[PDB]
Amino acid sequence: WKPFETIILLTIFANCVALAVYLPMPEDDNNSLNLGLEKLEYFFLTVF
Amino acid sequence: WYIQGAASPKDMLILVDVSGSVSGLTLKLIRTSVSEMLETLSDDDFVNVASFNSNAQDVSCFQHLVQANVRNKKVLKDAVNNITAKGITDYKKGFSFA
Numbered sequence A: 001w002k003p004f005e006t007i008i009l010l011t012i013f014a015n016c017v018a019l020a021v022y023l024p025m026p027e028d029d030n031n032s033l034n035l036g037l038e039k040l041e042y043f044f045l046t047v048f
Numbered sequence B: 001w002y003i004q005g006a007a008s009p010k011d012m013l014i015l016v017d018v019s020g021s022v023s024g025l026t027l028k029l030i031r032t033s034v035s036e037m038l039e040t041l042s043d044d045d046f047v048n049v050a051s052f053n054s055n056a057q058d059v060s061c062f063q064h065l066v067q068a069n070v071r072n073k074k075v076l077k078d079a080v081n082n083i084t085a086k087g088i089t090d091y092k093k094g095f096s097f098a
């Protein structure tokens, strides 16, 4: 009805901040926030 | 002459960070610092050189602290040069190995 159109609009804004805060590092090197951000991708992959 | 009377002899151990982030201008700088750091070393000083990226290997053939005479230093300054950066940084296996 009303909020399912706007919780999935709030989910997607939270997916765009997770792509923003990703930090690309050379040669397969990762800090510890990039590891917790690929554990967020799985949660954003099922909601969608 | 200045160095021997500056300070007492010493067993040093150079760690080199070889994780992927270092590759670039920074990796280039490290190979020239370690060679530079060695110039400082003397015969009475012992020294080995290790390197870590999620495992700590040792840069050359030595595996213990060696006398850092003209020859030994020449081996270490020739293995510091060929290093390639790849992999995850691990300061825990780098200081255990040290």
Ligand SMILES: [Ca+2]
Binding pocket: A029, B019, B020, B021, B022, B088, B089
């Ligand atoms: Ca690193």
